[PDB]
Each structure stands twice: as C-alpha cells, then as structure tokens.
Design a protein around this ligand. Structure first.
Ligand SMILES: N[C@@H](CC(=O)O)C(=O)O
Ligand SMILES: N[C@@H](CC(=O)O)C(=O)O
Ligand SMILES: N[C@@H](CC(=O)O)C(=O)O
Ligand SMILES: N[C@@H](CC(=O)O)C(=O)O
Lengths: 315, 325, 314, 320
C-alpha cells in the first residue's frame, strides 16, 4: 500500500565523509524515517564528484530512469547527486525522460558527517516529494533546503550556502514545510512526456563547449572549439549575450564551419533577447550550463538554426 | 559656490540612440555625447557645476584594459586637482562588473568615483538614464560619499565596486549583491548610507598603474560537465600570465580542469579558482590546484589577478590579495 | 483586427502631478498603445490606493465582470496605486470569472518624475492584456517589466521601482525587448474556477489585521470585538506564533463567532497548522491577502474547516 | 590561551524538543553545549540560563534584564564576548534592543534555530558553533550586535525573519550580511554604517519599566479605533506599519493625529519589509527611515526614556 521509490545514487557531497564515498544503502540507513513514506530500493549508478559528471554517465542515468519508470512497480525515482553540476543533470533528464512519474534530484552542501548536515532532511523531502502522486506532470524536480525547484530554472547561485539553489525570477515550484508538500507554481515549458528529445538510441552526444564573455576576451578560444571539431558552442555572454568584436569574429568563424552557436549570459538570470545585429542563436532565459544541455540534445535531431532557436524558446 | 563634479564618458546604453521608443533590445551604444547626456537632465545644475569629458564612445562589451588604464590615470589626474570634487563615469552595463572594481584598486583619492549606467537607451520610454545620472551626480557631490570606495549607481541604489554586478541580462534592477547589499540607497531626493566596504580600497590600495602601459594577459575559463582540457592549452600557447577558472560550485575542478590548471602552473601562469555560481566563498582546499577567489566573481577575480601580476608572481602574496581586496 | 482593451482608472501615483490625472491624460501620454490595441478609458475612481476600500473594490469587481462578459472586450487594464496593490489584484483574482486578462498596473514614480515608470509599465500592461497567450493565468500585476501573479506578488520595498517581488514564487512572466516570456503558472484556484462571486453582494464583512510583536496588547482584540468585526487576520511573529496575550485575545474573539486566521508578519513562507494554537492558518498568504480571502470567504461560509481549506486551495 | 565566552539562554526552538525527529519540551543551556563538543576547540564556555520561553512571549522587561546582565558580563576583563540563545519569532527585536543598549566593544552574537534540536538535519548545533566562532574572534569587535544562523552573520540593525519557516529566513535584501562563515573561517565583508553599542546614548542601566509602544497595521478599510484603544490605555508611543512608504488612509491619518493630540509619539514605518519611508510634510507622524515596524517599536521605546522631543526622536531614526 505505500509507494515504491527507487533511489539511484550518483555520488556528490550528500555521499561524502570526513572529520569536518558513502554508498546508497547507508544514505537510506541514516534516515529510517523513509520507511513511512515509501518502499525503498537503492541503486548505485556511479560514485563520483558531480564536477566529474559527463554526458556519457548522463546517458546511462537517463536510460535507466526511463527503464524504471516504464515499470508498473516503480512509482517515482529519486536521484542522489552532487551540487556543482546539479544545474545540468536535472535539465538533461527534464528533456529526456519519457514518463510523467516524479524524477527528483536530491543533494547536500554539507557532507553526511558534518554538524547540522543537510543530506538527511534533503533526502527525506526528496523521497516524500517523489512518493506524492500530485508530484506528477511537473517536470524534473530539484529538492534541497525545503524547496522543490524546476530543472528548467533552478541552479546553484551561491558557492557554499545551504540555500544555494534559487531561481530569483521563477521561484520554486513548491515547498516542503512541517512534513507537508505545498505546490504553488507550475513550469510553463515543454518537458518530459511532451519533449521531442529521445536519447534512448544514442551512444554518444555531440561535444559542446562554453566560452566566457569578458573584457579583453580572446578570439583564440573559439579557434580551439573549431579545431577540436566541437559541434556546438555556448557563449556565456557579457550582460545579454553581448559579444565584443573578438566574440563576434570567433562566433562568425565557428558558424561558417557549421557550428551552432547560442548566446546565453554570464549574469545568472534573465532573457537574452533576439538581435539581428549580433551573430548566433539566442538562449532565451537559459543559463550557459543548461543551454549546453539543450544544444547538446538539440544536435541529435537537427543542425537547423531556426528550428533549434525554436527549441530554445519552448524548452 | 557649490560642488564641482566632472563627468567622464565611455559610451554604453546610457548614451545609446534608437529609431523608436517602444524598443528596448538591439540599438546603438555610445551614439551620443556627454553633453547630450548632461543637457537632458537640466536638474543637475541644482546639485553641481558640471564639466563633461568624452574618454571613449564604445559599448562596454568592447571595454579593454587599455582604455581602463587611460581612464584610471585620468580620474587620478582630476581628483588630485583642487577644482574637482568627484567624478561620475557613464558606462555600459555589460562589463560594469569589472571597470568599477578596476578603479576601486587604482584610484588614489578619498573623493567619490561613481560609475553610472542605464539598461534602457535614452530614446526608450521610461529611460532609466536621466534618473540614474541625477543620482550619480548627487552621490558624487555629497561630501559624505567620501572614502567609501568606488561606487556604482542605478535604480536608486549605490553599490560597491567590490560586490555589485549585473545579475540579470535585461532588467532595470540588475545590479545587486545578494550577500553584501548596497552601501546606500537614494530615496526622495536624499542619500541614505547604510553599509561600508570592509575590504581594502583606493587610498589604501597597493596597486598603482600611473606608469603602467600594458597590463598582463588574463583569460577566464569556464567550468562545466565535459569541460575540455584544450582551453588551458590555448591560454598557454598564447603567453597568458594568469587564468581565472569560472569553476563549478565553489571552484571545483574536474579531472580535465585539474590537469589543465596544473599545466598552466608548470609554465608559471597564476591560476585562481572562482565560481560560475554568482556569489559566495570559494574556500581554500589543498587537494585542489590554483589559488582561491574568496567571494570575487570570475570577472572581478580577473581584474585583481591582472593588477596583482604587475606587482608579484608569488602565489602566496596573490592569495593574500584576494582575501584583502 | 486589433484587440479591444478597456483601461479602468482607479487613481494612484501612475496618475500623479508634482513640481519636480485622469485616465485619458495617461492614455494620451503613451501613443504607442495604439500599436497594441483599440483602447477605451474609464474613470472608476481617482484616489490614492492607500484609501482603497472594499466598497470601491466591489464597484470595480462587478464592473470588470460586466466588461469581460462582452463580445467586444478582450481584456482589462486597471491603473492603481502601489500602496495597496497587495490587496486589489488578489480581490479580483477570486471574484473575476472570465479567462480574459485582467492586468493591474502601477508606477512608483509620478508621471512628472525623471525617468517616470508609468508610461513603460502602462505599455507593458496593455501588451500583456492584448496577448491571447495571457488568458486564464489569473489576474496579473505588471510593473518593472515583470508579470506578477495576484496570489503571490506584493510590495516588498517601500520606495523602489522593483518593489514587486515574490521571492518564493518568482514571476509568471517577463517583458523584454518588446516581447512576452511566460515562464510559470499559478498552481492555485483562480478566476473562472473560483467559487467567490460578488455579483450579489452590497457590503463586504469587516476584517481586521492585528500585528504580532513583543508585548503585544490583548486590548487590540477587545477593540475589534467591540465593533463586531466578522474576521480577524493575525500578522503573527514568525510562522503565525501567538503570545499569551495574543493566544487569549484570539480565543476571546473565536468564542464570539469571529473567524481568526493566523498569518505572518515576516513577508513570505508557510504558516503551518498547529493544534496547540487557536485561529486558522494562512498557508503562504500574507496578512493583507489573508484579509481579502477571509472577508470574501465570509460571504460564503462561517465554517472553520471550509474556510481553512480555501486558504490552502486559493 | 582560549577566549572566555558566556552563553546566555532565553529559550527558543534552538532549545526545543519534540516526540519524533520528523517534526515542545524545553532544553537547558548545558544540553545545548554538550550537544556540540567541538565548541571547546573555540572557547571556554560558561552557560547561563536567563529565561526559558518562546520568543513570542519575550517582553521588554526580560530584555531589560538581558541587557543589564550582558553589560555586567562584558565589563569584566575575563569575558571576551557573549552568545545569546533566543527564539527566531522575535529576533527581529531583541538584537536591535541590545544594539542600542550594550556599552561594550566586545561581540554580542545572537543565535537561534528554525528546526527543533530534535529534528532531522536540525540547524541548532551548527548555528551555535558559528555563533561561538564569531563571538570568540577578536575581529568580531566593534561591529554592533550580531545575528548568526545558516552560516550568515547579520547586523542586528538590518536583519529580520523574512520567511515563516525556512532555514535561510534571516536576510536583509537591501543591506546584505556583515559577514559569512564558510569552511570554518569567518569572512567579514560589510560594516554597519549606523550608531551602535559604544556610541549609543541609550542607557537603560537604571531603568525598571520601559514605555509602552503599540504597533498598528495599515491596510484597506483600516479602523480608526485601533488608535483609540492605543490612546485609552496610556501608550507612550505608536508605530504605524503603513501601506507602501508609511502611507496613511483617512482613518490612520485621523487616528495618528488624535494620538499626537495626547503627546503620543507616532512613527510611520512600512509593512513591506524593506526600504526608506521618506519624510512627507503633508502627512502626520515621524518617519522610520529604513527601520521595520518591530525595530521601530524598539527605537521609539528607548527614545521615550530619554526625550519626548519630536525633532530629536526623528534624528535617532536617521542615525541608529
Ligand atoms: N563537489 C561536490 C559538491 C557538493 O555536492 O556540494 C559535488 O559532488 O557536487
Ligand atoms: N551593450 C550595452 C549595455 C548597457 O550599457 O546597458 C553596453 O554595455 O554598453
Ligand atoms: N500613494 C500612492 C503610492 C503609489 O501609487 O506608488 C498610492 O496611491 O498607492
Ligand atoms: N516559537 C519559536 C520559533 C523558533 O525559534 O524557531 C521561538 O521563537 O521561540
């Protein structure tokens, strides 16, 4: 009679130890309170720092997620993950998961052996959220610090705080307070069941690099991407994707070689607006790191700029 | 009879023209002169005797350190004069993260140095420029602005060069510091100071570019999943003196990054691990290469690192700098 | 071919003169509205929103409902002051019953100020209202290039242009470079799905807001009691926490049939249920929005459990 | 060798228990101290139990007691600083009281915790550690009264509970934090540009009862009678939690004026949660500057022990 939730562990600080790494079965054991929310099965997809998360491991994760959500005896899925790269992995699965069932990413800033470690509660909130049927159809979820954020908006905004994960402009989809879920907001983009993206039959994703925008920014960074035959480049623009004349050169250069370039921003938030005056596609409100994921996945369907641009406004 | 303020222009949307007023995105930055700017706010004659000066007429995307030196040498030139009470600097927003901070390190006077910008062209409806400029001259003329570090004014806020930054691509209230706030606000034609910068700045800064003609080259390299090593090889192949890593979370290096950083350190390039995050502390970790950016943005870390390398190549001296400025 | 939009004028700083105004002056001032829609102006009232009252709200609410029921009205823009934009839009959010966009707009600076925000806000509001894609999103609050939900957004700073924020909830959408980007949707009961109708209401119940604080006087409840208020909202310390003096005074009111909601003086967040304390609980609703919900709920029911649920659903 | 730090306990959720860890009985100061053995690496601790209450119930009387005692401790050469355990519900006020009230350079760090000590991932232990770390840094000196939760060091003058229930609640969007605590080092970033502690004129050393000040909220249809009830019960000051920038409706206008008739001092603050309420000649009452309703009661309250002069009280609000 209780929901059947699978915890796929991938590593991260939620799984570390010290005197201030640890497998899935322990994370579960450190919170016996999980018993009261779901029947839990644990599975170890990887044990790496999320900084070392790569498109390849994401292909395995995504495939295993869809494989499990296809099952009649799996109600939702909770994914244990680091925070340094939690910007990208949930957005990946938001684009790539074929189910309506809850996929929920959980993480912690303090390791399990820290004074007032956030992992235990984050995990509890994440399983509770996953075990809720009202949690379906919401897109991939990101749960830490009592907040349920959308994979499309939520990112790490502070380097070291427990409350890092924010989306200033779009808030949190909802909230977990006093052992109650409080949904307030619904993502208004294409995701999960409605997404045209399918990585089920993909062995390898196209390479996509990220170039920063800044005063005196080198044109030779683009030459690198161009040389190594990268498929896409995400410019992390000054302000609203603004390019200097080196950005301009580098980008236009890349574009003649058939490299799809998307101008995002280095600011943290907001719309990069369309502009005939500048080269490259526009990222809408997509962060540089999430733009990479969308571009990377977009480059498995098409190379067409207007089409991909279309994705960038809808996804 | 009243304070003598000088406005030094560098271009930017504050001085952008556009064909129509409904249009907010995609125009000509630095199309108009400091005199056109000043003329549109005749209210400034209530605050200051104003002299305008055109240092540059570029969009701040194209702001180069070469113009920064020139600008920094000029501010110091003026504030040393008896007839100059404070400077206002009109500037783009795209790169207003870095120019204020630069002069925060290189200005040598108590006097107010207030950068000012607009998110909307002068032609836009409800253009923020005039009010912003009014506030900028206000702050500058007020003796009580003295010794507060270099200041950034937009949207009735007075932020510190050290903390403030463009936090949104396109909104008027872009310039924020979640963790540090604003030194002061401007409300009902009054200045309210609330905060002071608890870092080293201006008069007490050890960095002096009065006689420097070429600042050392510093590249920023982003952190992300599947980040390539070859970007580090690129900076090395080009004789760069410092690299700022815009790291994942608190400057976390991937395998590729660790190796890339480490190649750079071999050939004597100083590496600072900053954060793509947007705020907060990158703490020392002796299990990771390069030094640590404290709470300085990749943009700002690039500036300090650059100016640091004019003084020393000592990794420990520079690490001290990040913790102090 | 171009959408029909009625701008309903209520007053506010968006319509103020200085030495450093009717709906038609406002319209005249943004000639670019003509590119967005065909515009009719109406002056519902001309007050500072600080002087906005339930009975003017009713007049407005019915008029809005009346306008939106026409074939030839596509949407409604309400010009209004900021000091009470917390309340007015939420009111309409529950009482309106078309999917047609109802867009409140305001300005922190008067039209005469350097870099006055009125014109641009008014432009945005109309653009939003004239967009087919705006339908059925609940009542909206446009200022400073954001589309806020009436359920969430509130004045968070006394005097800045960007005052209107909902930290926990962000914006519904945004207006950048002359285009609208919708991003999130109100996951609460609103407009067409709301049970709250005021068509047949002449006077709304009286509801007071009492502030929570160290040494808070119990007599404030005694006062609200003397004047036979129907409901009290408590702007509690923290998550709606009562002192002994608040505990007893609320319990006092509750025994006289007055319905008490416990909200927060904090600015955001959930006041969770608690059997150890009296009053109902305000979910994430502010004190000012709690008033609007409670006073409307009092037109329907006096039943604590039903009222309580409204606060979790609406 | 190590700094001597006194912990003064007043109660609060930091000292709060519950039946299960997934969700109240009181816990002593020494229970809080033994829960964190790592404190001994930071300082010598003395525990002192001043009160044991929810901060809902914190009164101006106990704050007087809390003040006199903190001044008495800090006056000693062998006391380097004091950490105060206090509920979150009324940390808006107590800290600011002490900020005007303490005569010492020496750190006064308030600490609290949003989740009970009993709760899974409870925030009490780490918060206090932080609070003691700050109180035992000699660099915490001369910064005014300090508030530590969620790794942040906030100024008493600015910081407030902005969310009902979350861990990161205590913010000040316009002013930020004075410092933060990250990876077991303190990082100072900002200084309070206001009169505080040693420069304050507010002396309650010989004050037994504080004047009464009510807070009356501003809203649509706001009743004039709140003001009358304030008046009837001999209140010496009223703080107005106004609409926008302390804006008064016809009723608050009449009501304030009435209270001004009786020599009740009124301050127009704001219900919004941040920002400047400007002077407006065409409106009654004094003006709060950027002070919240809660902190305004506190500043008004103390000003009325010193003076009843409208001009002088207004100066306090632009200075403190
Ligand atoms: N390096 C860690 C950081 C964290 O989880 O907080 C990670 O795996 O992402
Ligand atoms: N592209 C412009 C943006 C602005 O100033 O608002 C610049 O940086 O010059
Ligand atoms: N007093 C004005 C303030 C404003 O609109 O900004 C009002 O009507 O609310
Ligand atoms: N009721 C508690 C709330 C808390 O501390 O979290 C108090 O203020 O004492």
């Amino acid at each position: 009679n209780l929901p059947n939730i699978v915890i796929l562990a991938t590593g991260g600080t939620i799984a570390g130890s010290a005197a201030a790494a640890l497998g899935v079965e322990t994370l579960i054991q450190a919170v016996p309170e999980l018993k009261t929310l779901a029947n839990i099965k644990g599975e170890q997809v990887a044990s790496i720092g999320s900084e070392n998360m790569t498109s390849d491991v994401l292909l395995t994760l995504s495939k295993r997620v869809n494989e499990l959500l296809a099952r009649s005896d799996v109600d939702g899925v909770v994914i244990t993950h680091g925070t340094d790269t939690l910007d990208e992995s949930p957005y990946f699965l938001n684009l790539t998961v074929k189910s309506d069932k809850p996929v929920v990413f959980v993480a912690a800033m303090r390791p399990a052996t820290a004074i007032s470690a956030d992992g235990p509660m984050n995990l509890y909130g994440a399983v509770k959220v996953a075990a809720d049927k009202n949690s379906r159809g919401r897109g991939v979820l990101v749960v830490l610090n009592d907040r349920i954020g959308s994979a499309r908006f939520i990112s790490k905004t502070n380097a070291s705080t427990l409350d890092t994960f924010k989306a200033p402009e779009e808030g949190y989809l909802g909230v977990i307070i006093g052992d109650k879920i409080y949904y307030q907001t619904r993502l208004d983009k294409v995701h999960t069941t409605r997404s045209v993206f399918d990585v089920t039959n993909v062995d390898k994703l196209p390479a996509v690099d990220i170039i920063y925008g800044y005063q005196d920014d080198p044109e030779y960074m683009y030459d690198a991407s161009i040389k190594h035959g990268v498929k896409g480049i995400v410019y992390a623009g000054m302000g609203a994707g603004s390019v200097s004349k080196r950005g301009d050169a580098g980008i236009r250069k890349a574009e003649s070689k058939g490299i799809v370039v998307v101008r995002s921003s280095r600011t943290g938030s907001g719309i990069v607006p369309p502009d005939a005056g500048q080269p490259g596609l526009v990222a809408d409100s997509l962060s540089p790191a999430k733009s990479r994921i969308l571009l990377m996945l977009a480059l498995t369907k098409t190379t067409n700029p207007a089409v991909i641009q279309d994705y960038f406004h809808a996804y």
